[PDB]
């Protein structure tokens, strides 16, 4: 009963995503499993939706960037791991590219390793590119909660974008 | 003393015929050959280094035989795996390896190949930290692996490149040897965190919670969901020059590809064969996944070859690429075992007694193999062929003056009457 364009529709939709029960049609070995799947599903819809909202903001920002690694980061802002990986590849940033492929697997090894690399840089590290550090911070799993913190991006992005 | 040898093999046969499982025979044959490999090797005339390698080779042969015949013959059929589409790629990979024995065999063989791969000693005096020389000279505006790729390699100090070479070569040897854990340890400890991270992409995704049927092996999700991507990402990385040839080699191996010429030129029969079975395997898995819609279209970034070779053909190609090595008589048996065309080759080398007599190991090995085969698989080798083989080997037991242990070999014919 509402226009898919109206902000109202956004309110009701987001509210549906977070609160309305999800159903998972396929039968599951035990029920704690079910619970886990339901969590993944909900998470995926929420994050697809957030990407729907922040979409144009970021696309504008990518339009105006003059630096490739920054673009790679912005593609990560749209939760597009693959195009980040691709641009990395293309802009000859290959290792990063590989690293990028981890974003969204929650591999704690990779997490503590990324954080480690960041401390080593932030203790000497004569110079590290401003956006590579941002990407590593994403791999760290705690991008504001941190000591190389993206919190300052508070002033450059929609709160929703950082969330 | 060493002219004891036949005893050892004979000895093993004694023990078997007397505790009246037969796979132990071969296991012992292996150990026996290996023990002998050590003897001729340690202190020796440089005429012995040759027959020493022919013993090490002997040993590897017995091992390969054990592995394959154990899997093929101790086949008592277990329970089928019932997947759902919601299941992770990890499970589908597992299912594939369960259901397709032809392909698991390829795995077995690769495992054997790795087992017997040489790895250099761990590099000493490794530096405190990565690219330290470039950092110290000033001129690394970014400390990330991709920086000198973004703009001319002139950025990296010579010594740094030289060290990256030492590292990537060592990691590569470890990867070809199956030493993945050691490779991750080296990456971690040598301040190559990002490379380590690259090595972590090797695993397909599993979630113990969803993929119930492995909620035993795992307590936590692991492995990476967008693997077809990972794989193209790595392969593309592998094709990007201005990287050390061993690093590119690594990424080649990981993507199921064939490493660059600079590295491949130094690979031997075993190494090369390994590389190409790896390729078969990788291709076959990814195809298995496509036939079950467990690959997402977004991830097909790049073209990788889809057509798997057959083990037959890989062998033929690797053969023509390494003729000398290929033609070595125990490595022919190695291949014969791999393809199962084994009694096939027995009857063959049998007719070569009717330049097999010139090399000493051969006539022995074929005989003991034939014995093992008919023990494990009654019927395996033609009755006649057993007769002919033992006949000729026995007459050598006579020429060696070891009549003592001839009855043991007799225990396979009524022809024995004639002794």
Short mmCIF file of C-alpha atoms in Angstrom, two decimals, chain A residues 24 26-30 32-34 36-37 40 69 81-82 85-86 88-99 101-102 104-110 113-114 116-117 120-121 125-129 132 136 139, chain B residues 86 135 140-147 149-150 168 184 188 191 193-201 203 205 207 209-210 212-213 221-226 229-230 233-234 236-237 240-243 247 251 298 301:
data_model
loop_
_atom_site.label_atom_id
_atom_site.label_comp_id
_atom_site.label_asym_id
_atom_site.label_seq_id
_atom_site.Cartn_x
_atom_site.Cartn_y
_atom_site.Cartn_z
CA UNK A 24 13.68 -21.26 5.97
CA UNK A 26 14.60 -26.42 3.62
CA UNK A 27 14.64 -29.08 6.33
CA UNK A 28 17.58 -29.04 8.68
CA UNK A 29 19.48 -31.85 10.49
CA UNK A 30 18.96 -30.20 13.95
CA UNK A 32 20.36 -24.94 16.19
CA UNK A 33 21.47 -25.26 12.67
CA UNK A 34 18.15 -23.84 11.58
CA UNK A 36 22.16 -20.32 12.33
CA UNK A 37 20.75 -20.32 8.80
CA UNK A 40 22.69 -15.79 7.89
CA UNK A 69 43.23 2.10 -4.31
CA UNK A 81 34.34 -7.88 -2.89
CA UNK A 82 34.62 -9.09 -6.45
CA UNK A 85 39.43 -7.71 -6.30
CA UNK A 86 39.10 -7.01 -10.04
CA UNK A 88 43.08 -4.39 -7.66
CA UNK A 89 44.03 -6.97 -10.30
CA UNK A 90 43.71 -4.36 -13.07
CA UNK A 91 45.48 -1.54 -11.28
CA UNK A 92 48.23 -4.09 -10.80
CA UNK A 93 47.49 -4.41 -7.12
CA UNK A 94 47.47 -8.19 -7.11
CA UNK A 95 48.43 -9.23 -3.56
CA UNK A 96 45.83 -6.86 -2.13
CA UNK A 97 43.40 -8.40 -4.60
CA UNK A 98 44.03 -11.82 -3.07
CA UNK A 99 43.65 -10.40 0.45
CA UNK A 101 38.88 -12.19 -1.35
CA UNK A 102 38.74 -12.85 2.41
CA UNK A 104 33.16 -11.71 4.45
CA UNK A 105 34.68 -14.98 5.57
CA UNK A 106 35.32 -14.32 9.21
CA UNK A 107 38.64 -16.20 9.37
CA UNK A 108 40.11 -15.21 12.77
CA UNK A 109 43.61 -16.08 11.54
CA UNK A 110 43.34 -13.46 8.82
CA UNK A 113 47.25 -11.24 11.02
CA UNK A 114 45.81 -8.08 9.44
CA UNK A 116 49.36 -7.46 13.41
CA UNK A 117 50.49 -5.99 10.11
CA UNK A 120 53.89 -3.21 12.86
CA UNK A 121 53.23 -0.36 10.46
CA UNK A 125 56.36 1.83 9.31
CA UNK A 126 57.90 4.84 7.55
CA UNK A 127 54.85 5.21 5.25
CA UNK A 128 51.87 3.09 4.20
CA UNK A 129 49.32 4.20 1.57
CA UNK A 132 45.71 0.12 1.91
CA UNK A 136 43.71 -3.94 6.14
CA UNK A 139 40.33 -7.30 7.28
CA UNK B 86 21.89 -25.29 0.94
CA UNK B 135 62.01 1.10 3.86
CA UNK B 140 58.32 2.86 -0.01
CA UNK B 141 55.34 5.24 0.16
CA UNK B 142 53.29 2.18 0.88
CA UNK B 143 54.36 -0.97 2.69
CA UNK B 144 52.03 -3.30 0.91
CA UNK B 145 53.01 -6.10 -1.44
CA UNK B 146 51.22 -4.40 -4.33
CA UNK B 147 53.01 -1.06 -4.13
CA UNK B 149 53.21 -3.27 -8.83
CA UNK B 150 51.21 0.01 -8.88
CA UNK B 168 59.10 -17.56 -2.42
CA UNK B 184 51.83 -20.94 6.78
CA UNK B 188 53.65 -15.89 9.61
CA UNK B 191 56.72 -11.26 8.32
CA UNK B 193 51.40 -11.99 6.67
CA UNK B 194 49.72 -11.11 3.38
CA UNK B 195 51.18 -14.11 1.56
CA UNK B 196 50.08 -16.27 4.51
CA UNK B 197 46.61 -14.90 4.12
CA UNK B 198 46.85 -15.87 0.42
CA UNK B 199 47.70 -19.44 1.44
CA UNK B 200 44.58 -19.48 3.64
CA UNK B 201 42.31 -19.24 0.58
CA UNK B 203 40.12 -24.16 1.69
CA UNK B 205 33.87 -23.25 2.74
CA UNK B 207 30.10 -24.55 8.28
CA UNK B 209 26.41 -25.95 11.76
CA UNK B 210 25.00 -26.20 8.25
CA UNK B 212 26.08 -31.21 9.78
CA UNK B 213 27.89 -34.29 8.40
CA UNK B 221 33.00 -22.28 10.10
CA UNK B 222 36.11 -22.05 7.95
CA UNK B 223 37.29 -21.70 4.37
CA UNK B 224 36.18 -19.08 1.89
CA UNK B 225 32.76 -18.90 0.24
CA UNK B 226 33.58 -17.18 -3.06
CA UNK B 229 36.59 -15.89 -7.38
CA UNK B 230 39.57 -16.51 -5.11
CA UNK B 233 42.03 -13.80 -8.44
CA UNK B 234 45.03 -15.96 -7.66
CA UNK B 236 45.35 -13.60 -12.58
CA UNK B 237 47.85 -12.67 -9.89
CA UNK B 240 51.03 -10.66 -13.57
CA UNK B 241 54.75 -10.20 -14.28
CA UNK B 242 57.10 -8.12 -12.14
CA UNK B 243 56.55 -10.79 -9.51
CA UNK B 247 55.71 -16.48 -6.34
CA UNK B 251 49.84 -18.95 -7.50
CA UNK B 298 29.53 -13.32 -10.59
CA UNK B 301 35.71 -13.37 -13.63
#
